[PDB]
Design an enzyme around this catalytic site. Structure first.
Site, PDB file in Angstrom:
ATOM      1  N   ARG A  65       2.918  -0.564  -1.708  1.00  0.00           N
ATOM      2  CA  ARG A  65       2.322  -1.229  -2.599  1.00  0.00           C
ATOM      3  C   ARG A  65       2.887  -2.675  -3.131  1.00  0.00           C
ATOM      4  O   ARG A  65       3.046  -3.654  -3.148  1.00  0.00           O
ATOM      5  CB  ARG A  65       0.549  -1.205  -3.163  1.00  0.00           C
ATOM      6  CG  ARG A  65       0.139  -0.256  -2.148  1.00  0.00           C
ATOM      7  CD  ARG A  65      -1.141   0.135  -3.469  1.00  0.00           C
ATOM      8  NE  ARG A  65      -1.526   0.888  -4.153  1.00  0.00           N
ATOM      9  CZ  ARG A  65      -1.419   1.927  -4.507  1.00  0.00           C
ATOM     10  NH1 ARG A  65      -1.975   2.512  -3.244  1.00  0.00           N
ATOM     11  NH2 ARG A  65      -1.332   2.393  -5.815  1.00  0.00           N
ATOM     12  N   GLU A 102       2.233  14.668  -5.942  1.00  0.00           N
ATOM     13  CA  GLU A 102       1.201  14.705  -5.651  1.00  0.00           C
ATOM     14  C   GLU A 102       1.827  16.468  -6.618  1.00  0.00           C
ATOM     15  O   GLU A 102       2.257  17.048  -7.998  1.00  0.00           O
ATOM     16  CB  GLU A 102       0.865  15.969  -4.582  1.00  0.00           C
ATOM     17  CG  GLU A 102       0.509  14.534  -3.843  1.00  0.00           C
ATOM     18  CD  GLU A 102      -0.337  13.539  -4.250  1.00  0.00           C
ATOM     19  OE1 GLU A 102      -0.926  12.701  -3.432  1.00  0.00           O
ATOM     20  OE2 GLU A 102      -1.134  13.404  -5.109  1.00  0.00           O
TER      21      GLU A 102
HETATM   22  N1  LIG Z   1      -4.147   5.831 -10.543  1.00  0.00           N
HETATM   23  C1  LIG Z   1      -3.268   5.507 -10.064  1.00  0.00           C
HETATM   24  N2  LIG Z   1      -3.326   4.220  -8.980  1.00  0.00           N
HETATM   25  C2  LIG Z   1      -3.098   3.516  -8.403  1.00  0.00           C
HETATM   26  N3  LIG Z   1      -1.378   3.629  -7.663  1.00  0.00           N
HETATM   27  C3  LIG Z   1      -0.956   5.014  -8.107  1.00  0.00           C
HETATM   28  C4  LIG Z   1      -1.784   5.651  -9.191  1.00  0.00           C
HETATM   29  N4  LIG Z   1      -0.935   6.558  -9.965  1.00  0.00           N
HETATM   30  C5  LIG Z   1       0.231   6.109  -9.052  1.00  0.00           C
HETATM   31  N5  LIG Z   1       0.120   5.484  -8.045  1.00  0.00           N
HETATM   32  C6  LIG Z   1       0.958   5.039  -7.194  1.00  0.00           C
HETATM   33  O1  LIG Z   1       2.168   5.597  -7.017  1.00  0.00           O
HETATM   34  C7  LIG Z   1       3.579   5.275  -7.657  1.00  0.00           C
HETATM   35  C8  LIG Z   1       3.522   5.271  -9.217  1.00  0.00           C
HETATM   36  O2  LIG Z   1       3.794   6.911  -8.970  1.00  0.00           O
HETATM   37  P1  LIG Z   1       4.825   7.486 -10.040  1.00  0.00           P
HETATM   38  O3  LIG Z   1       5.840   8.025  -9.005  1.00  0.00           O
HETATM   39  O4  LIG Z   1       4.323   8.299 -10.868  1.00  0.00           O
HETATM   40  O5  LIG Z   1       5.285   6.275 -10.747  1.00  0.00           O
HETATM   41  C9  LIG Z   1       3.111   3.932  -7.364  1.00  0.00           C
HETATM   42  O6  LIG Z   1       3.734   3.479  -5.922  1.00  0.00           O
HETATM   43  C10 LIG Z   1       1.871   3.617  -6.901  1.00  0.00           C
HETATM   44  O7  LIG Z   1       1.550   2.709  -6.473  1.00  0.00           O
HETATM   45 MG   LIG Z   2       2.790   3.324  -3.967  1.00  0.00          MG
END
Ligand SMILES: Nc1ncnc2c1ncn2[C@@H]1O[C@H](COP(=O)(O)O)[C@@H](O)[C@H]1O
Ligand SMILES: [Mg+2]
Ligand SMILES: Nc1ncnc2c1ncn2[C@@H]1O[C@H](COP(=O)(O)O)[C@@H](O)[C@H]1O
Lengths: 178, 178
Positions: A65, A102
């Site tokens: 994204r 996850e």
């Molecule tokens: N609640 C959420 N809504 C949408 N995208 C998320 C969400 N949590 C994580 N992501 C996606 O996962 C990545 C961020 O997760 P993190 O690595 O935990 O910061 C990004 O690439 C986001 O697109």
């Molecule tokens: Mg992403």
């Protein structure tokens, strides 16, 4: 700020997607409304020019994204965009870095020749949550001896403390939710 | 065409990736060179305006490399961009379609509210090979009762006969390789 309002009113939230407990923030309406998309890119670009002046060499967009914002942000700044991908997608010599996602693990990857030592980069993704993804991106850029000036996103989930995880790398988000 | 040359000279070709005998066409240098990326978007936008006039309502970008071009192309045309994603990534009501990818199956998916019946769309991806990916995208859009005016890409691999697969949906590419 009416520009910021154009972005905020185009984020939609989905409770318990994709699994129970997670509130998914969907940026799809920002992309579909050209005024909203232009506003988001402009707010990010204004912040970056105001903070870094002419010091940014490249934008780095994160798969997948972040790819939606990276090239447009780079273009607005007169810069190129480099890619950081999910592992297994890039040709040529690569480096990779994990970071639990996850209940398990996953890896980002960058081409060994994506940047030269000393080049200054700003990383963009749609949303910062735990910071694991951005943190892996910073690790990879650091391993190319690049200087990460800042990480930016449209959305930050503050209860997950991704900002603290990225410190001392500066972080900026357009919008914050718990 | 000096603009087209700017794009051509930034496609890097990697033999035997991911498997022996295949030549991977890497668009990364196009993204990294702001003049090249601007040329690619301008060439695509010029083609689409000349071909479709005011008929286009939205650009649809395909996950993941199409995300790199979709939003910029849409912005250049004054349009929004809708997203077609690998299955499981999008929240809310969706439609999905299977298609053959490499040695197995994969699935693409679109949100049911991405488009209304009668809306007209151009699909963009970085590269057309067998056409399976673009064909699945067309199927999904057709099921929302949207009209696909054209599919476009930076690169087309002509020996794989993707154009023929998409027929009668028109197709256009900036660059062609066997
Ligand atoms: N609640 C959420 N809504 C949408 N995208 C998320 C969400 N949590 C994580 N992501 C996606 O996962 C990545 C961020 O997760 P993190 O690595 O935990 O910061 C990004 O690439 C986001 O697109
Ligand atoms: Mg992403
Ligand atoms: N030789 C290649 N070089 C780079 N990407 C490719 C190649 N062949 C297929 N792809 C990617 O796979 C998808 C197209 O495959 P296809 O469905 O066979 O047309 C596109 O999203 C392309 O980015």
């Amino acid at each position: 700020d009416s520009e910021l309002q154009l972005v905020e009113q185009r984020i939609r939230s989905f409770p318990d997607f994709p699994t129970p407990g997670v509130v998914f923030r969907d940026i799809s309406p920002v992309l579909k409304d050209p005024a909203s998309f232009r506003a988001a890119i402009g707010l990010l670009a204004r912040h970056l020019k105001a903070t870094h002046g002419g010091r940014i060499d490249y934008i780095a967009g994160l798969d997948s994204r972040g790819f939606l914002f990276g090239p447009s942000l780079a273009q607005e700044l007169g810069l190129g965009c480099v890619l950081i991908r999910k592992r297994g997608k890039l040709p040529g010599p690569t480096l990779w870095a994990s970071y639990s996602l996850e209940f398990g693990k996953a890896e980002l990857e960058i081409q060994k020749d994506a940047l030269e030592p000393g080049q200054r980069v700003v990383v963009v993704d749609d949303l910062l949550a735990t910071g694991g993804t951005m943190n892996a991106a910073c690790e990879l850029l650091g391993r190319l001896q690049a200087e990460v000036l800042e990480c930016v996103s449209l959305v930050e989930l503050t209860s997950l403390k991704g900002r603290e995880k990225l410190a001392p790398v500066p972080f900026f988000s357009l919008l914050q939710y718990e």
